[PDB]
Amino acid sequence: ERGWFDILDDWLKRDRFVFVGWSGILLFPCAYLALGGWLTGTTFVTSWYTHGLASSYLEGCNFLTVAVSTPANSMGHSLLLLWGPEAQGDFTRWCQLGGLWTFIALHGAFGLIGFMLRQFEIARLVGVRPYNAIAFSAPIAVFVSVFLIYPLGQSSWFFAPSFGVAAIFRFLLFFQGFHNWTLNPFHMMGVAGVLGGALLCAIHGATVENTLFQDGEGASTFRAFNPTQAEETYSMVTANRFWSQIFGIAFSNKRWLHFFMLFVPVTGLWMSAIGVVGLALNLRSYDFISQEIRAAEDPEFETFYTKNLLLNEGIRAWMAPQDQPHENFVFPEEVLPRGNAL
Amino acid sequence: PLGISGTFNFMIVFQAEHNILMHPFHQLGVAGVFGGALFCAMHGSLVTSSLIRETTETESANYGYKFGQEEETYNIVAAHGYFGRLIFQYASFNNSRSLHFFLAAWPVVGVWFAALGISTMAFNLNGFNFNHSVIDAKGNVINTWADIINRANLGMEVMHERNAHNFPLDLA
Amino acid sequence: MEPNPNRQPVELNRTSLYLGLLLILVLALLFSSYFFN
Amino acid sequence: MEVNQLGLIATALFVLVPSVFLIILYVQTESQQ
């Protein structure tokens, strides 16, 4: 019969403005704390003791330069719980030690779990297939590989991305100079999936909007659609002929078309995640050995591949002393790699 | 350059000379292509989730659609009923024409700004420069993440085209 | 021997052949540089 | 250039094995009914 579990199930699944669900018990606290943690840190909290950086509006940063920065390298991979052995329950010290970083990363991870459970739960209630939850596995693979696996393979959370606009840009440039990440075929597949997904988004939207049937008298054509109508609002047959004659091939099956729109960006993000798992271990696509053997013996042999390595060497030497303060690097002027004049 | 590694060379030098990552037109470009990929996966997943049953368990559901059939092959009312509950009702498109216009406009506008980013950095109006923007009471520089970006950019700058510069400023 | 009632025919249409060959060939064009190293 | 000597057969089998899988499946579809 209707026990307390079923009575609770009733209330959780009420059709209200913001659906709750069983998944909401996990999703809403964790999403709220991750977002609230980020807003709290970027507004008020420094990175002076972990990075030697200002990182909050309170210190004078703007929206592009605020961040919640990773903990000091000496923390290792500490969970850095507020009640843990590092902060010992002291909220102020916890903030100064980087506790908001693991707070956001961990509540964010469980919030993402809660969101994907929500996608399953709602799909089951309204009676649709759960492909939206399936497609969301790609955001999850990215978050887990970049914010958890990658630093877990490295020396500490310090080398995870810090949560901020400019901080993420630094992460990109670090990956170029140290990992040569642009050369990695798993990143290249990710790029193809993202740009190919954006291409499909644009071309499908434009094709539908330009093969519409005239279903009203208005020159603005949005009102000539009824959600309950049975008929296609655009001509698949005309769309197919156009693209066949323009590009050589065209979709003819709308079910395949829309599955392909799931497949392409979702697969790309999954591939990029695999490459980052490799970079967790410094298992890079850094070099082509045949190129290096030839270049070492032949000082006239030059390609764009060898040119980019010189850029990477500059990035490493010029950014490492300030970007890795725990190493206490001191690079005398005379050892810095530089071309002529610059 | 017309090549894969030559493309990366162009990007890295562009960052050194224009700080493109800190330029809002490139940031709009990223929103355009990340968003385009997101909405591609979203639209694909929502239409696929609401395909009307026309096939058996042992055949591809794609045979449930026939080229040129007049009826829609998925239930947009079900798809909206799902997505409107995922977020909230008024954050979801119930008008297929509005939806597909949005799918066109978001990546197209974002990539227009990407193109305009490159085309205006072509005339050296560059990304935001916050180098040494934060200063303490004495005047010590307090670094931000922008200053760390600057160190990386410098490494690119001093090394690129290592034999081509004779004078101290790279003015083009 | 009595036949198995669970057997099913398998299909691959021409478009799927073309899509699959494109995937394989492009993956090969991509990964071959790293195989030769 | 001093390339990896297994790269040629790696690339050749990478192409051939899944391609022939697909060709086998395609041709036996055409020959049905």
Binding site: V237, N240, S244, G248, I249, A250, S252 | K66, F67, G68, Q69 | N13, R14, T15, Y18, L21, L22, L25, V26, A28, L29, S32, S33, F36 | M1, V3, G7, L8, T11, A12, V15
Partner: peptide, 30 residues
């Protein structure tokens, strides 16, 4: 052997384009 391999794969792709376009399964209104 590397160059032959790269150009061979590329040539197969171009041939595939030709067949995918001119010898496609024709779209038919059902």
């Amino acid at each position: 052997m590397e160059t032959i391999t790269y150009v061979f794969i590329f040539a197969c792709i171009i041939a595939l384009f030709f067949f995918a376009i001119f010898f496609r399964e024709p779209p038919r209104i059902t």
